[PDB]
């Protein structure tokens, strides 16, 4: 009944932050609860992945253990090939004000480059954020779906992608793409993040903040979904949403008196599986959110 002001709520958060950064295995135990909730959701078959488990879709899933929930999967309606199904390993992640703020998805496969672009198109996606390298752990983790300077135009079904510009920056690149489809030409902005903040090194978290701030300089609102992907579309994909989300609350003076990263992630994992893969990412989210709050003083 007696509401407290934003700042004060940040101070409550900051005050705690101190002891928590100490509380033994606090983060470990915290994250261990996330896995638990998932295990219970899978035991009760609460969130079906039937569509993604159909035979014809197996070739469209990069990892067998990462399957999009049915009720929150991005359905592909745009038909261009007598062989275009509706499936795609991706989910809608709700935003601070409503559904479809994000499209957490995997790195497209050679066999899903078409479906990828259908999606981006059908939902007028303006921003695409790639949070990974094409090559990691000695192997390929994402297929080429964008176009690079002086490289003409790659073709996926009826889509034409050419790279008009490519503003390289500190830790990421901004490819200004032009996609053609049935006489229509749209501009998509891809934010390729090759590096990843250093778990315990507070200084290394700044680059990731720069990205979202940059990303948000291109699309302040939530009119259209923001596509965010990694190899699997769970871990790093999940770190970006949460921080952007939290940041969105902070940018509008609406951080719930009882805000917590654990709860924000808990809720996100109900929309997309394995969102925020490990303890390290969990902690990164927490540390990054903390840095933001400190910056509000």
């Amino acid at each position: 009944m007696a509401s407290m002001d934003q700042r004060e709520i940040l101070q409550k958060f900051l005050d705690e932050a101190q002891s928590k950064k100490i509380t033994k295995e606090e983060f470990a135990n915290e994250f261990l609860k996330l896995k638990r909730q998932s295990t219970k959701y899978k035991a009760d078959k609460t969130y079906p992945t039937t569509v993604a488990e159909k035979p014809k879709n197996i070739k469209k899933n990069r990892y067998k253990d990462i399957l999009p929930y049915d009720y929150s999967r991005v359905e592909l309606s745009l038909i261009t090939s007598d062989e275009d199904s509706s499936y795609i390993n991706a989910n809608f992640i709700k935003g601070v004000y409503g559904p479809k703020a994000y499209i957490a998805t995997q790195g497209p496969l050679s066999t899903t480059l078409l479906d990828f672009w259908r999606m981006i198109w059908e939902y007028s996606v303006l921003i695409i954020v790639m949070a990974c390298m094409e090559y990691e752990m000695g192997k390929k983790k994402c297929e080429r779906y964008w176009a690079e300077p002086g490289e003409m135009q790659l073709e996926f079904g009826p889509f034409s992608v050419s790279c008009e510009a490519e503003k390289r920056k500190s830790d990421y690149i901004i490819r200004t793409l032009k996609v053609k489809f049935n006489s229509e030409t749209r501009t998509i902005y891809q934010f390729h993040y090759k590096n990843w903040p250093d778990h315990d090194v507070p200084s290394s978290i700044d680059p990731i903040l720069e990205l979202i701030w940059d990303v948000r300089c291109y699309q302040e609102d939530d009119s259209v979904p923001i596509c965010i992907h990694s190899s699997a579309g769970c871990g790093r994909t999940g770190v970006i949403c949460a921080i952007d989300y939290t940041w969105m609350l902070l940018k509008d003076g609406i951080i719930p008196e009882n805000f917590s990263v654990f709860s924000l992630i808990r809720e996100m994992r109900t929309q997309r599986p394995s969102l925020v893969q490990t303890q390290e990412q969990y902690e990164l989210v927490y540390n990054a959110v903390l840095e933001l709050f400190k910056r509000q003083m």
Partner: peptide, 9 residues
Amino acid sequence: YGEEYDDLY
């Protein structure tokens, strides 16, 4: 390709 994103990677 399908090979556990969790199983290490």
